[PDB]
CSV table of C-alpha atoms and ligand atoms in Angstrom, one decimal:
chain,number,residue,atom,x,y,z
H,28,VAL,CA,135.9,93.3,110.1
H,29,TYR,CA,137.6,95.7,111.9
H,30,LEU,CA,139.5,98.7,110.5
H,31,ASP,CA,142.3,100.7,111.1
H,32,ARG,CA,141.6,104.5,111.7
H,33,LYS,CA,145.2,105.6,110.2
H,34,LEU,CA,144.0,104.1,106.9
H,35,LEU,CA,140.6,106.5,107.1
H,36,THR,CA,140.6,109.6,106.1
H,37,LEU,CA,137.4,111.7,106.5
H,38,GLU,CA,136.2,115.2,105.4
H,39,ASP,CA,134.7,117.4,107.5
H,40,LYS,CA,131.3,118.4,105.9
H,41,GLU,CA,128.8,115.8,106.6
H,42,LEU,CA,126.3,114.4,104.0
H,43,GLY,CA,124.0,114.4,106.5
H,44,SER,CA,123.3,114.0,110.0
H,45,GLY,CA,120.1,112.9,112.4
H,46,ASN,CA,119.1,110.6,115.4
H,47,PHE,CA,121.3,107.8,114.3
H,48,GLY,CA,124.8,110.5,114.4
H,49,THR,CA,126.5,111.8,111.2
H,50,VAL,CA,127.5,110.6,107.7
H,51,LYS,CA,130.9,111.7,106.3
H,52,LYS,CA,132.5,111.3,103.0
H,53,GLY,CA,136.2,109.6,103.1
H,54,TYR,CA,139.0,107.7,102.1
H,55,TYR,CA,140.2,104.2,103.2
H,56,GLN,CA,143.4,102.9,101.9
H,57,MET,CA,142.9,99.3,100.9
H,58,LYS,CA,146.0,97.0,99.9
H,59,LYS,CA,146.9,99.0,96.8
H,60,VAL,CA,144.1,101.5,95.6
H,61,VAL,CA,142.6,104.1,98.2
H,62,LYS,CA,138.6,103.2,98.3
H,63,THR,CA,136.1,106.4,98.5
H,64,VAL,CA,133.6,105.8,101.4
H,65,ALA,CA,130.4,106.8,103.1
H,66,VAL,CA,131.0,106.6,107.0
H,67,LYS,CA,128.0,106.6,109.4
H,68,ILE,CA,129.8,107.9,112.8
H,69,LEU,CA,127.8,107.3,115.9
H,70,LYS,CA,126.3,110.6,117.7
H,71,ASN,CA,128.8,109.6,121.2
H,72,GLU,CA,126.8,112.7,123.1
H,73,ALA,CA,123.7,110.1,123.1
H,74,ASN,CA,125.2,107.4,123.6
H,75,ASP,CA,122.1,105.2,125.0
H,76,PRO,CA,124.0,102.3,124.3
H,77,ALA,CA,121.5,101.1,121.7
H,78,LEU,CA,122.8,102.8,118.6
H,79,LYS,CA,126.1,101.3,119.4
H,80,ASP,CA,124.0,97.6,119.7
H,81,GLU,CA,122.3,98.1,116.3
H,82,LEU,CA,125.7,99.4,114.3
H,83,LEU,CA,126.8,96.2,115.4
H,84,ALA,CA,123.6,94.6,114.3
H,85,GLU,CA,123.7,96.5,111.0
H,86,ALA,CA,127.3,95.4,110.2
H,87,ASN,CA,126.4,91.9,111.0
H,88,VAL,CA,123.7,92.1,108.4
H,89,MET,CA,125.9,93.9,105.8
H,90,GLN,CA,128.7,91.4,106.2
H,91,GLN,CA,127.2,88.4,105.1
H,92,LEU,CA,125.4,90.0,101.8
H,93,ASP,CA,127.2,89.7,98.3
H,94,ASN,CA,125.5,91.1,95.8
H,95,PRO,CA,126.1,94.4,92.9
H,96,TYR,CA,122.6,95.9,94.0
H,97,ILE,CA,123.4,95.9,97.9
H,98,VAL,CA,125.6,98.9,99.5
H,99,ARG,CA,129.2,96.6,100.6
H,100,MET,CA,130.4,97.5,103.7
H,101,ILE,CA,134.6,97.8,104.2
H,102,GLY,CA,134.3,97.4,107.5
H,103,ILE,CA,133.9,99.0,111.2
H,104,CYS,CA,135.9,101.3,113.3
H,105,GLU,CA,135.9,101.8,116.9
H,106,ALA,CA,138.0,105.7,117.8
H,107,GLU,CA,136.3,108.8,118.5
H,108,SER,CA,133.2,107.1,118.2
H,109,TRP,CA,131.7,103.5,116.5
H,110,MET,CA,132.2,104.2,112.7
H,111,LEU,CA,130.2,102.0,109.9
H,112,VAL,CA,132.5,102.0,107.1
H,113,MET,CA,130.7,101.7,103.3
H,114,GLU,CA,131.6,101.8,99.9
H,115,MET,CA,130.8,105.5,98.6
H,116,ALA,CA,127.5,105.2,96.5
H,117,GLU,CA,128.2,109.1,95.1
H,118,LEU,CA,125.0,110.4,93.8
H,119,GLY,CA,123.2,109.7,97.1
H,120,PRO,CA,119.4,108.8,98.0
H,121,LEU,CA,117.1,107.9,95.0
H,122,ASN,CA,114.3,110.3,95.9
H,123,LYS,CA,117.0,113.1,96.5
H,124,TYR,CA,118.1,112.7,93.4
H,125,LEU,CA,115.0,112.6,91.2
H,126,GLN,CA,113.5,115.8,93.1
H,127,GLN,CA,116.8,117.5,91.7
H,128,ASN,CA,116.6,115.5,88.3
H,129,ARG,CA,113.0,116.1,86.9
H,130,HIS,CA,114.6,114.8,83.0
H,131,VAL,CA,115.3,111.3,84.0
H,132,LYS,CA,113.5,109.4,81.7
H,133,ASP,CA,110.8,106.4,82.9
H,134,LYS,CA,113.0,103.8,80.9
H,135,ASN,CA,115.9,104.8,83.4
H,136,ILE,CA,113.8,104.8,86.2
H,137,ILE,CA,112.5,101.5,85.1
H,138,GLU,CA,116.0,100.4,84.7
H,139,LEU,CA,116.8,101.5,88.4
H,140,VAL,CA,113.5,100.0,90.2
H,141,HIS,CA,114.6,96.5,88.3
H,142,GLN,CA,118.0,97.0,89.8
H,143,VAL,CA,116.2,97.8,92.9
H,144,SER,CA,114.4,94.2,92.7
H,145,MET,CA,117.1,92.3,91.4
H,146,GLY,CA,119.0,93.0,95.1
H,147,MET,CA,115.4,92.6,97.0
H,148,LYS,CA,115.0,88.7,95.1
H,149,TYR,CA,118.7,88.1,96.4
H,150,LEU,CA,118.2,89.9,99.8
H,151,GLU,CA,114.9,87.0,99.5
H,152,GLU,CA,117.0,84.2,98.2
H,153,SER,CA,119.0,85.0,101.3
H,154,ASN,CA,116.2,85.2,103.6
H,155,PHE,CA,117.1,88.6,105.3
H,156,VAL,CA,114.0,90.6,105.5
H,157,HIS,CA,114.9,94.4,104.7
H,158,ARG,CA,112.1,96.4,106.7
H,159,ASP,CA,113.3,99.8,105.5
H,160,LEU,CA,112.4,99.5,101.8
H,161,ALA,CA,112.3,103.1,100.8
H,162,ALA,CA,113.0,105.7,98.1
H,163,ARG,CA,115.4,107.5,100.4
H,164,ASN,CA,117.6,104.0,101.1
H,165,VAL,CA,117.9,103.3,97.4
H,166,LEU,CA,121.6,105.1,96.5
H,167,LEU,CA,122.7,106.0,93.1
H,168,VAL,CA,126.0,104.8,91.9
H,169,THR,CA,125.7,106.5,89.0
H,170,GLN,CA,122.4,107.8,87.0
H,171,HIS,CA,121.8,104.3,85.6
H,172,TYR,CA,123.2,102.3,88.7
H,173,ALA,CA,121.0,101.8,92.0
H,174,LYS,CA,121.8,100.0,95.0
H,175,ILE,CA,120.1,99.3,98.1
H,176,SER,CA,121.2,100.3,101.5
H,177,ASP,CA,120.1,100.7,105.0
H,178,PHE,CA,120.1,97.5,107.5
H,179,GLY,CA,119.3,99.0,110.8
H,180,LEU,CA,115.9,97.4,110.6
H,181,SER,CA,117.1,94.5,109.0
H,182,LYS,CA,116.6,91.1,110.2
H,183,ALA,CA,118.3,87.3,109.7
H,184,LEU,CA,115.1,84.8,109.5
H,185,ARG,CA,115.1,82.0,111.4
H,186,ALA,CA,115.6,78.4,109.9
H,187,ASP,CA,112.4,77.3,110.9
H,188,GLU,CA,110.4,80.8,110.0
H,189,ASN,CA,109.1,82.8,106.9
H,190,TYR,CA,108.8,85.8,108.9
H,191,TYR,CA,110.1,87.8,111.8
H,192,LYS,CA,107.9,88.9,114.4
H,193,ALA,CA,108.7,92.1,116.6
H,194,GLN,CA,107.2,92.2,120.1
H,195,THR,CA,106.4,96.1,120.3
H,196,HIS,CA,106.0,98.8,117.6
H,197,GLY,CA,109.1,101.1,117.3
H,198,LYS,CA,110.1,103.7,115.2
H,199,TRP,CA,108.3,102.5,112.0
H,200,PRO,CA,108.7,103.6,108.8
H,201,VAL,CA,104.7,103.3,108.3
H,202,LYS,CA,103.7,104.4,105.0
H,203,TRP,CA,106.3,101.8,103.6
H,204,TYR,CA,104.7,98.7,105.8
H,205,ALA,CA,102.1,96.0,104.4
H,206,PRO,CA,98.9,95.7,106.8
H,207,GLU,CA,100.1,92.2,108.5
H,208,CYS,CA,103.1,94.5,109.9
H,209,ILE,CA,100.8,97.0,110.9
H,210,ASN,CA,98.3,94.9,112.5
H,211,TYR,CA,100.3,91.8,113.3
H,212,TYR,CA,104.0,93.1,113.9
H,213,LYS,CA,104.7,90.3,111.1
H,214,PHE,CA,108.0,91.0,109.1
H,215,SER,CA,108.7,88.8,105.9
H,216,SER,CA,109.9,89.0,102.4
H,217,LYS,CA,106.4,89.8,100.8
H,218,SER,CA,106.4,92.8,103.5
H,219,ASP,CA,109.4,94.3,101.5
H,220,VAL,CA,107.5,93.6,98.7
H,221,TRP,CA,104.8,96.2,99.7
H,222,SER,CA,107.2,98.6,100.6
H,223,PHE,CA,108.8,98.0,96.8
H,224,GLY,CA,105.3,99.2,95.5
H,225,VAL,CA,105.7,102.4,97.7
H,226,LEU,CA,109.4,102.8,96.4
H,227,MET,CA,108.1,102.2,92.9
H,228,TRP,CA,105.5,105.0,93.4
H,229,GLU,CA,107.9,107.4,94.8
H,230,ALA,CA,110.4,107.0,91.9
H,231,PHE,CA,107.6,107.4,89.4
H,232,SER,CA,106.6,110.4,91.4
H,233,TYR,CA,110.2,111.8,91.3
H,234,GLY,CA,110.9,111.5,95.1
H,235,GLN,CA,107.2,113.1,96.1
H,236,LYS,CA,106.4,111.6,99.5
H,237,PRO,CA,104.1,109.0,99.0
H,238,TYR,CA,100.5,109.4,101.1
H,239,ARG,CA,100.8,113.5,101.1
H,240,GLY,CA,99.4,115.0,104.0
H,241,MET,CA,98.3,112.0,105.8
H,242,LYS,CA,99.5,110.6,109.3
H,243,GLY,CA,100.2,106.9,109.6
H,244,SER,CA,96.9,105.9,111.1
H,245,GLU,CA,94.6,107.8,108.1
H,246,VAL,CA,97.1,105.6,105.6
H,247,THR,CA,96.4,102.2,107.6
H,248,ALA,CA,92.4,103.1,107.6
H,249,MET,CA,93.0,104.5,103.7
H,250,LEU,CA,94.6,100.6,103.2
H,251,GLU,CA,91.6,99.3,104.9
H,252,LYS,CA,88.6,101.0,102.5
H,253,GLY,CA,90.7,98.9,99.7
H,254,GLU,CA,92.0,102.6,98.3
H,255,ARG,CA,95.5,102.7,97.1
H,256,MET,CA,97.7,105.8,95.8
H,257,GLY,CA,96.9,106.6,92.3
H,258,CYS,CA,99.2,106.6,89.0
H,259,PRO,CA,102.0,109.1,89.0
H,260,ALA,CA,102.0,111.3,86.1
H,261,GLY,CA,103.5,110.3,83.1
H,262,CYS,CA,104.2,106.5,84.6
H,263,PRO,CA,103.5,103.5,82.5
H,264,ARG,CA,100.2,102.0,83.2
H,265,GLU,CA,102.5,98.5,83.4
H,266,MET,CA,104.3,99.7,86.0
H,267,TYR,CA,101.1,100.9,87.9
H,268,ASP,CA,100.0,97.6,87.6
H,269,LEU,CA,103.0,96.3,89.1
H,270,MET,CA,102.6,98.6,91.8
H,271,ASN,CA,99.2,97.8,92.8
H,272,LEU,CA,100.0,93.9,92.7
H,273,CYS,CA,102.9,95.1,95.3
H,274,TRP,CA,99.9,96.2,97.3
H,275,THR,CA,97.8,93.0,97.5
H,276,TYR,CA,96.3,93.2,101.2
H,277,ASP,CA,96.8,89.8,102.0
H,278,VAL,CA,100.4,88.6,102.2
H,279,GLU,CA,99.4,85.1,101.5
H,280,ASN,CA,98.1,86.1,97.5
H,281,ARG,CA,100.9,89.1,97.3
H,282,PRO,CA,104.3,88.3,94.7
H,283,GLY,CA,107.5,87.2,95.8
H,284,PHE,CA,110.6,89.4,94.6
H,285,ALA,CA,111.3,86.4,92.2
H,286,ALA,CA,107.9,86.8,90.3
H,287,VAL,CA,107.9,91.1,90.9
H,288,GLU,CA,111.7,90.8,89.4
H,289,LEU,CA,110.6,88.6,86.6
H,290,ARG,CA,107.9,90.9,85.5
H,291,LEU,CA,110.3,93.9,86.2
H,292,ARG,CA,112.8,92.3,84.0
H,293,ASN,CA,110.5,91.5,80.7
H,294,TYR,CA,109.3,95.0,80.9
H,295,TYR,CA,112.5,96.9,80.9
H,296,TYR,CA,113.8,94.3,77.7
H,297,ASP,CA,110.1,95.9,75.9
H,298,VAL,CA,110.9,99.2,76.7
H,299,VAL,CA,114.5,98.7,75.7
H,300,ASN,CA,113.3,97.9,72.3
H,301,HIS,CA,111.7,100.8,69.9
E,18,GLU,CA,106.9,112.4,109.2
E,19,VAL,CA,108.7,109.0,108.2
E,20,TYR,CA,109.6,107.1,111.4
E,21,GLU,CA,106.3,106.7,113.5
E,22,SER,CA,106.1,105.4,117.1
S,425,LIG,C1,115.0,114.2,100.7
S,425,LIG,N1,115.9,114.2,101.3
S,425,LIG,C2,116.2,112.7,101.1
S,425,LIG,O1,115.4,111.6,101.1
S,425,LIG,C3,117.2,112.3,102.0
S,425,LIG,C4,118.5,112.9,102.6
S,425,LIG,C5,119.4,112.1,103.6
S,425,LIG,C6,119.5,110.8,103.2
S,425,LIG,N2,120.5,110.2,104.1
S,425,LIG,C7,121.4,110.0,105.2
S,425,LIG,O2,121.1,111.0,105.9
S,425,LIG,C8,122.0,109.0,105.4
S,425,LIG,C9,122.3,108.5,106.5
S,425,LIG,C10,123.2,107.1,106.8
S,425,LIG,C11,124.1,107.3,105.8
S,425,LIG,C12,123.6,107.7,104.3
S,425,LIG,C13,124.6,107.0,103.3
S,425,LIG,C14,125.2,105.9,103.4
S,425,LIG,N3,126.0,105.4,102.0
S,425,LIG,C15,126.5,104.1,101.8
S,425,LIG,C16,127.2,104.3,100.8
S,425,LIG,N4,126.6,105.5,100.2
S,425,LIG,C17,126.4,106.2,101.1
S,425,LIG,C18,125.5,107.8,101.3
S,425,LIG,N5,126.2,108.5,100.0
S,425,LIG,C19,125.7,109.7,99.4
S,425,LIG,C20,126.3,110.4,98.5
S,425,LIG,C21,126.0,111.5,98.5
S,425,LIG,C22,125.2,112.2,99.1
S,425,LIG,O3,124.7,113.7,98.7
S,425,LIG,C23,124.4,113.9,97.1
S,425,LIG,C24,124.5,112.0,100.1
S,425,LIG,O4,123.3,112.7,101.2
S,425,LIG,C25,122.9,111.7,102.1
S,425,LIG,C26,124.5,110.8,100.2
S,425,LIG,N6,125.1,108.1,101.9
S,425,LIG,C27,122.8,108.7,104.3
S,425,LIG,C28,118.6,110.1,102.7
S,425,LIG,C29,117.4,111.0,101.8
């Protein structure tokens, strides 16, 4: 897991930045080949050191995951700051991509969201809860290959429980959270299925922000009234129904990823045939 | 806008 700073070459341009720190493109010398990487670099100035604890927690979750539809961690490095070195997904965030590529066809969107469900079906099987499943966290390798990223809120489920109980409401992506998450702080894989429904809405809306113009509290209020976001323009009716199914209010009656993935798989096969 | 406390 611990990498050699001499084997890592960084570019000066930041691909992204924020409260987490910055993200940079780089290269890492492997056994023979050189590997293009995305490196999450900690702010350092704003130490905390909560940032360092969550970066190693994120690294610990990533090290346990092995699936084609999940971003692979190369390793961690302690140098100028703590660094999380990941295999680069060249095209970046799905919402950013689709906002700049409105010519992407519905069949291609179905192909990409299906790949996200396959990775989520694997995460569910591994008893990991994602807790930040959103279009911004789906990264594209190519226009036909999506991977799930950002395990900063992820939790390994206890052997005796189906969900993770948070104690306090943190800095949460509320618009992607199921009612049980907001109301009882309970996160299960079915909670991630709810987030998956929102991600699907985002993808078929070409990376549009969900619940536009609304506060999280107004979203919670809307969801309680049994109201849901409308069908995106050009979105197949079968995809919208799958979105509404992911948005089943009661966690007990919501499908799991194996059911969600199967529905997506069969519909993709139908779309491929013409 | 995205992460709310
Ligand atoms: C509408 N706007 C957006 O939605 C929006 C804006 C920026 C971001 N994300 C970030 O700040 C961010 C933060 C931490 C890490 C990464 C991260 C991680 N990885 C692991 C493997 N590959 C990557 C990887 N690739 C990448 C490749 C190409 C890009 O530019 C075209 C690019 O730009 C961010 C990232 N990035 C990203 C999310 C959403």
